[PDB]
């Protein structure tokens, strides 16, 4: 059979954090006990910048300049810390998409190298023809 349906295009995405207890020699406040990296990337670390313009990570208010804008790949940031907290993640798509910001969050994990990584997909419903061309450009 055949039927008309809303257009949908999916793009695989990997996001989350890694963490490691810091050794003898520290990088950095003395209070800090862990090194951690929060990130958004593609599978096999393939480029995602062709449909993602920038990624903004908002850290806890205890961090200086908690709004960290990463406007070029790799869309990640490495920091030091002592505590676990919720990091707000805003994904901005390229201007061709004419899309609202994609908002989600990730709970930074430091305790059971520790890692908290998700392998999901971003679903674009009703994309415009131009952004569709970009998404299909692979």
């Amino acid at each position: 059979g055949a039927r008309i349906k809303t257009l949908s295009v999916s793009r695989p995405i990997i996001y989350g954090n890694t963490a490691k207890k810091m050794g003898s020699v520290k990088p950095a406040p003395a209070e800090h006990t862990h090194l951690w990296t929060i990130f958004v990337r593609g599978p096999q670390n393939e480029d995602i910048s062709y449909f993602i313009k920038k990624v903004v990570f908002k850290l806890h208010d205890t961090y200086p300049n908690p709004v960290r804008s990463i406007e070029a790949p790799p869309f990640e940031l490495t920091e030091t810390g002592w505590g676990e907290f919720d990091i707000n993640i805003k994904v901005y798509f390229v201007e061709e998409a004419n899309e609202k910001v994609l908002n989600f969050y990730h709970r930074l994990r430091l305790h059971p190298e520790v890692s908290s990584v998700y392998f999901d997909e971003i679903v674009f419903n009703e994309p415009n023809e131009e952004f569709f061309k970009i998404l299909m450009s692979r």
Binding site: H60, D61, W82, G83, E84, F85, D86, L110
Partner: peptide, 8 residues
Amino acid sequence: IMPKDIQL
């Protein structure tokens, strides 16, 4: 106020 402890 947002929570931030050694472990959540």
